Amino acid sequence: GEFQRKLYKELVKNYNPLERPVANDSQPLTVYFSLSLLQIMDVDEKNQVLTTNIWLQMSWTDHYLQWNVSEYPGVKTVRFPDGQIWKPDILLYNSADERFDATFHTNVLVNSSGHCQYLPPGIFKSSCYIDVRWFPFDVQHCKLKFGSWSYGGWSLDLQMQEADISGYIPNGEWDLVGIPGKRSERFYECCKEPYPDVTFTVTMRRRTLYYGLNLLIPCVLISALALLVFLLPADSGEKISLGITVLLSLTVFMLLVAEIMPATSDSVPLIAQYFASTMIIVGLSVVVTVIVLQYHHHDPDGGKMPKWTRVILLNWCAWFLRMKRDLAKILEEVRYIANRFRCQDESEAVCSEWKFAACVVDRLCLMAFSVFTIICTIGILMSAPNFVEAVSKDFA
Amino acid sequence: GEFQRKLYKELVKNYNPLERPVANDSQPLTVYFSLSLLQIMDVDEKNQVLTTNIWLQMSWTDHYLQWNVSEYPGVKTVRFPDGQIWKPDILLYNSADERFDATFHTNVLVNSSGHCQYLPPGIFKSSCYIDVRWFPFDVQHCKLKFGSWSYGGWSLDLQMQEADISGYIPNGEWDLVGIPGKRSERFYECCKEPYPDVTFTVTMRRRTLYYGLNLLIPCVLISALALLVFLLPADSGEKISLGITVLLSLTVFMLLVAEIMPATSDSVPLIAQYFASTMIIVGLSVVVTVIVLQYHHHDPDGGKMPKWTRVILLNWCAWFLRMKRDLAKILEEVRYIANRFRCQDESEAVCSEWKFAACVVDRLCLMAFSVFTIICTIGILMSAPNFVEAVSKDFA
Amino acid sequence: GEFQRKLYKELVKNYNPLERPVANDSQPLTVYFSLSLLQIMDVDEKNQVLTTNIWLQMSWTDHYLQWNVSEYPGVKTVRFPDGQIWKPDILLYNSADERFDATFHTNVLVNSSGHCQYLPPGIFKSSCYIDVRWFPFDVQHCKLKFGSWSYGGWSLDLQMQEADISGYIPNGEWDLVGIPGKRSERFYECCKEPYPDVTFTVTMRRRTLYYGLNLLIPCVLISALALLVFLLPADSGEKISLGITVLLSLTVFMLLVAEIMPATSDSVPLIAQYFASTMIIVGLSVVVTVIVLQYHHHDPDGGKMPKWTRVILLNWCAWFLRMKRDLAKILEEVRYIANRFRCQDESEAVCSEWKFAACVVDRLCLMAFSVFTIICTIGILMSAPNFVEAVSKDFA
Amino acid sequence: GEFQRKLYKELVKNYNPLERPVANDSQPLTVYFSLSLLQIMDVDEKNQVLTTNIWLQMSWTDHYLQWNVSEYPGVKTVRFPDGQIWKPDILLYNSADERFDATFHTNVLVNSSGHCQYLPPGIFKSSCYIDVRWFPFDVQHCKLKFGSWSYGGWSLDLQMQEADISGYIPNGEWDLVGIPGKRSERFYECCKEPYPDVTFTVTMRRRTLYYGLNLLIPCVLISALALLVFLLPADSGEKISLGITVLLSLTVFMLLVAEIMPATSDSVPLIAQYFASTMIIVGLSVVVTVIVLQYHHHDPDGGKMPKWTRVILLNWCAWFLRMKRDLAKILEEVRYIANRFRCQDESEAVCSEWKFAACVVDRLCLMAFSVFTIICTIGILMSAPNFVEAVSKDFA
Amino acid sequence: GEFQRKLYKELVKNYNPLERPVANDSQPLTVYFSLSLLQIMDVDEKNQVLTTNIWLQMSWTDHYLQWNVSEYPGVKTVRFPDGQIWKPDILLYNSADERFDATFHTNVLVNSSGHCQYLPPGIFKSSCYIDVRWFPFDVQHCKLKFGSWSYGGWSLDLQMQEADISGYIPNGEWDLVGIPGKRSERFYECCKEPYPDVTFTVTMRRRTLYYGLNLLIPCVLISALALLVFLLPADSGEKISLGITVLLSLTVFMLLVAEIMPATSDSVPLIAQYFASTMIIVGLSVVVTVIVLQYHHHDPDGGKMPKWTRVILLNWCAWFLRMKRDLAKILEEVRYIANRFRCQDESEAVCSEWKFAACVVDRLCLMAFSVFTIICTIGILMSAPNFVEAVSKDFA
Ligand SMILES: COc1cc(OC)c(NC(=O)Nc2cc(C)on2)cc1Cl
Ligand SMILES: COc1cc(OC)c(NC(=O)Nc2cc(C)on2)cc1Cl
Ligand SMILES: COc1cc(OC)c(NC(=O)Nc2cc(C)on2)cc1Cl
């Protein structure tokens, strides 16, 4: 209308967009800063960045942009674009991204009394420290440090308001716990003026239903097939072909983990310890299997039991496991044939007890390795904090 | 011409590109918003974004850009570039992308009576929630929330017009169902002015011919080779080398699925349940195979049938399966040789019935596992909604 | 010089860069549009885009930028940068890229009589439909739709000139066939003015020397090793270890194809059909091998030939394949030993004919599967159109 | 100072940044163009681009930017930013990148006599043709075509100066040979004015120490294990399990090569021919191994030597290889037992000579395949040009 | 306030942002340059770049921007944005990135006496030379060359101040050692004016806890399973199936290393030498295993010991290893049977000593290969400098 056009011509008369809008150049300008988290787009572990879509809320006052509604009965609010009125230069300190602002400057609301409101939307890529420890059951605390870059505490008194999460669109993978905030003022090497800033800590918990179903459960079940080697009879030449196949094919899990873990030499992830533990157990099974196989094909008449394994694996362990173990010329020739058969029976008896001694080790190590696996998987997986919370919330 | 040059010099005289073009600063300016979907470029499941190429249709009126054709007989339409006339700041709220506008401002058509038309093309990357449940047979609903960012309901009365799909260039992978739209006005924490907005919901159905031919059909056929272990004779030492090879090599399918599924701990995909089901069936085959192998190489004269498997696998299951199962010195020596052979025949008879008992388990488990596989694959795959529609449209 | 400086000061006097340069505001301005393809950078199949480096040729006339050489003896051509003279807004409609123009505005040549020439270089990423059918032997037709965005047929009469390929720098992978063009005028929902546009169809043929040497030839040779299972004697326990190794290791080819094929559920690629065909043939070999192995270890005295395979695999197929197949006490004991040996010979004879019956199946299936493979590979590979052209141009 | 401020106010008085700085508008303006290569960042083979970090050296004269030092005793050089003085529009023609200039306009040095110097730094991504032939031992020639885009030969006489490599920071992977340059003037379809341009050809040699240690040497050593199959005794059922394991696991090398080779159907890389050659040799070993295994388990009394292999593999090849190869009732029964044993010895003798005949083939093919491998690896690897230079410079 | 608005109108009166702010145009302007490292974002080995987030500290003086506080009692500091006051053009020389500045120009602090301070934040991607030698235990020295691009030593006297690391946010993967700096002045081909510059060398040490736990430790343990082949009895046909499985499956480690090592043909990485060493040791085990297997299945009556291995592996090595090794017609027939058995015993005795001779080689090579592995792994891993420091800091 005619009044709005007239008002706009009067507000920008002798207006300098470089000066602070204070009426007295001795008191700081109070700027109220806030934040609104809209969603957590992606939390990259390798690059240790946090990509979020948030809004900002800057609110200050302007002494020069003032008018009364009596002279302009229709207009109660005017809007100035970027570059025509003074705005604070509050920006993210971390800003792990190519261009450093990431604010998408929009129009600036102006009151009927000079109060100024500014709501810029942007996608921020801050740099926070991802702690890969108790990795499937970890809680992350990523900081968001906001503050003015050129105005000190004597010019721009930056206040703070509580963060707003009214509308969050849950990410699904990360469970938001909260977002508390602080205002603190520090000192720097450039200047004696304190520089106040506001830091919003984003606390979020990882939902462990996905990884524990794709990395933990399959690892337990597949590693259980290595315990099945001790049930194969030694006659079927497949004991080594089963133990070595499972062991060397279970490596694919850590190749998946290597694509998720940052190469940080600071803390060993729990999933790495548990994956490392299940390799040694399977690896030791192959070592024990070889010990069994050399008792089976012992090639008798080339040694004897040292009477020490005679009482251990045949007397004590065998029961506790409950396994329970011219005619003279013609006469000389037929006697030799019978004597040859008798010696073969004695050789078969010695070879028979060696085979049973290899069966005791299979049954003994089946129970020894079974208890080793269950108390190790439980011990590692329960060792993490808030593990009972993680399974009571996602699984149950 | 001379008239067009004269008209352009008159329209921008005392024209302010910051004021609303209304003639009375008390009524809202009606802006008609529409949309035209041109193609769905890509639907990323991992990042949960939607990249589309669409046009926009903004249509309002301007009180100041008015003239009569009598004075200017030749010109009936003038065009102003970005930054010289007032335009609404309607933008996508979600805008999961670095720069937030994505509109590629073009020329603005101007009527002979002041009506304004604006048709900006752009490629929009919105953030919608991808629901990975019944994944090969899922229907997605992605929102497109458009609305003014600085003008409230009392200044910019944003109306809505139906979306246009006259020319869609079908994507091939995604089948478009429709695109309905709404206009709603909400309240926010900044202001008491309601902020109307228009939301276009993009409903699209995934064509399941590709994945079901590259992930479902090959999985069924390859998993059928694990059922072939029960047909191998136990003499060929390859029963374990066949069951363990198929099981550990079928893992490559989920490595492909892991590259498509977002790491969302909210719902288990159907293709994950069906892939998990076909691993346990194959995994249980190896466990059963080991049970068979220890009946084959039973090493007789070290145990006896407990008369419980004597009647089950040899009497009941065997029939229902229909398998149907100085001379004295010389005399003493030859008698021993015959007696040795007689004992060997008795040992061979006992070992023979153990081998047949292992054949009954192969035939029994062949039928038990075959019915387990067919009713599980059908049960999981039919469990999804609109599955009959998905196969009647893409396959048939 | 002094004349060029004087001329430049006269041309921009009272010049408006927003008006059409026509002298009468009732006739359209003729704009001649052309194109020059310089190289095809990349044809992405997954994203269905076409990245090309081309030049543009816009040619119109300007009524105001006119002067005579008599007054300015030295200058015959002036050049204006972007934003100082009127230029048409012709742009690519498809433009599957973030920023939509992709033209890199340069200087604009100006005649001595007002004729205007404009040659902008740019790298265009258009969206065309990639048809993955007869994939190694396919010909693609990608469109390039150019036209004005704000001027209709009554204001900007867009003409067309033939595309120029004088200098093409052949891509090596794609063989260019031609690039014909059209001009057509359509109607839209906004306006009653027809909007003429020019479409250049890029026709290109894929050279099939690379893929057919890295995907087709190796697949044929490796799949031929599955036919080698029928030559192994059954005594060497490696028949299953050879058939199952080749089958499960040939999967790597489709993992390579999956990285090239777009996930389009519209047409099955020929290379997918041929790769699927060679899996079933190899897969059926393992099924047949198991049938052979159970004839070898038949465990006689537990069944007999049903006299149906007695005449087929032993009488008909065996010939057409041409394989050609106190003294009394002592007397009783030695008689038993001889009788025991006689029964063993009868048991060995029955087991011998079972082994030969397994050899007939190996020789019979060797010829049955060999003819199955050759007529299937030839049948699928010849089924594609312009296949003889593809091998006569690239291979020969 | 006061003189520099005064001089700057005088130089931009009545100065037009659009006119050529010549004093007479009839002679071309001489522009001296040069180049300085600073490093070769990356040479991508798949996309056929060349990313280099180079400087430019443009040097012309300006008639209007002239002054005497007597009036301004302090200043001898002034600097104008981009957009205030006339600069040539020399740009890279190839420019395989999104934005086409890639020059990062900086300040422009100005002489005390009008001579102008301009040194813009930039990272250029040009499109050159990568020839993958003799791939580990190839030399590439990438062009850099620079020239004006809007000024012809009658306006901007573009000269050339030799390229400067004083400071190159060697890349490590690519060995620079030289960078010669040319100036040539061509004709185009737009205009009759010749357009001179300068082309700098970047000649560079690939260092072959890396690939030949990670692709060539490991391939030779691993392929040598396939020759070890002929030393295994046939009793150990692992001949097929060794030949088929090496063959199907050596495929990983070409999967690495496929990630480096562009999909160009123009020339077969040498490393592809050598990798293809070592597959056929290993593949033929498995075929020969099967021929051996059917001589070992020949199942005698089912055939006889055709007297042709009797003299070849047992008489000629065996020596040149130097391998050197009531009482009557009782009497009848014992005679049968002895006769049964005698027939078994005759059957064992026939089976023994079949096994030795399989040993001759192992020893014969061990020498036949060994000479096949050495003369093929040497023949392919020496076939490339400048191969002796490549090994005398990098290895030795 | 009124004074700040008045002051801003006076400072930009007759102010030229192109002239140097010196009062006498004969002395250079002293500019103090510094740097503050905030974190090391990523050190890419393949592309040889260094992405860091740092601040800059430029400090000079301005003669024209001076005023007294007496006239303006309130304001003591004014701030000018980019493009309104003179600023030096100091920029990174290396700048391995698309856009070359990477400085994110901010406001410029102005003193009450003319001293100027400028603190631009930016993320810099410099190009330094990554030396992949002693790769897990390497220390890198990356340069940061800063200097003016258009002002020489006679105009801009660039000084230097020590780098500041007060607040570093340790990266976790890289351990910072220090960041010393230099100022040097060189000569170039353009000009006779020396161009001073400041170079900051970033010295950083890689923490070796991650790789040595994921690449070194697993390689040692897995390679130890190849030494387990010498403990398997030869009767179980799995010696080759174990040696060849470990060898061909250990290749996955270098596929991981190939994704980290730049393709530089300048220095062989230590981890590559150690991975190459552990392949030959495992590869030689398979060669030795084949030698053992041909002693086991020696097929006697086809050769004899040459009396050279009779004393080595049976007399010397066997002890040092301590292994310790009508009646006439009836009479003729039974005599033949006994004689046949006697010849079999003599054939079994000869075959028995061949099998034991194969056991000596297993025990001899078990000790020979065990000492080969330990002294090779230790020798290679200790060969690197500062290896004891790397394990005393990260592991211990
Ligand atoms: C390669 O590493 C894996 C291994 C796996 O086992 C073999 C799985 N299997 C899996 O996750 N199955 C289920 C079950 C439910 C419920 O959901 N998913 C996945 C990966 Cl990635
Ligand atoms: C690795 O996972 C796969 C496994 C597969 O089986 C082995 C296939 N095979 C396939 O898809 N064959 C056909 C048939 C038709 C018709 O089209 N394609 C593909 C993948 Cl990706
Ligand atoms: C594929 O190459 C690997 C091989 C591996 O062994 C099989 C591992 N295993 C591993 O790292 N285990 C541990 C132990 C601790 C403590 O932390 N991690 C990893 C990779 Cl990448």
Residue numbers in the entry:
A (entry chain E), B (entry chain D), C (entry chain C), D (entry chain B), E (entry chain A): 23 to 347, 432 to 502
Excerpt from the paper describing this PDB structure:
Nicotinic acetylcholine receptors (nAChRs) are a class of pentameric ligand-gated ion channels (pLGICs) widely expressed in nervous system. nAChRs function as neurotransmitter receptors that respond to endogenous acetylcholine and choline, modulating neuronal excitability and synaptic communication. The homomeric α7 nAChR is among the most abundant subtypes of nAChR in the brain. Five identical subunits surround a central pore axis with 5-fold symmetry, forming a typical pentameric assembly. Each α7 subunit comprises an N-terminal extracellular domain (ECD), a C-terminal transmembrane domain (TMD) and an intracellular domain (ICD).
PNU-120596 (abbreviated as PNU) is the first reported α7-selective PAM that could increase the peak current of the receptor evoked by agonists and delay channel desensitization. In the EVP/PNU-bound α7 structure reported here, PNU is unambiguously assigned and found to insert into the TMD interface of two adjacent subunits. PNU interacts with hydrophobic residues in M2 and M3 of the (+)-subunit and in M1 and M2 of the (–)-subunit. Specifically, the larger halogenated aromatic group of PNU is in close proximity to T273, M276 and L277 in (+)-M2 and F275 in (–)-M2. Meanwhile, its isoxazole heterocyclic group points outward, interacting with V290 from the M2–M3 loop, A294 and A298 from M3, and L235, N236 and P240 from M1. A hydrogen bond between the carbonyl of PNU and the carbonyl oxygen of L235 probably provides an additional stabilizing interaction. Superimposition of EVP-bound and EVP/PNU-bound α7 structures shows that the binding of PNU causes a notable change at L270, which rotates away from the pore axis by ~110°. L270 separates M2 into upper and lower halves, and the upper part also displays a slight clockwise rotation. These rotations expand the channel pore near L270 and the upper part in the PNU-bound α7, which is in contrast to almost identical structures in the ECD, the ICD and the remaining regions of the TMD in the EVP- and EVP/PNU-bound states. In the EVP/PNU-bound structure, the further rotation of L270 (9′ position) side chain leads to a marked dilation of the upper half of the pore, leaving the region around –2′ position as the only remaining constriction section.
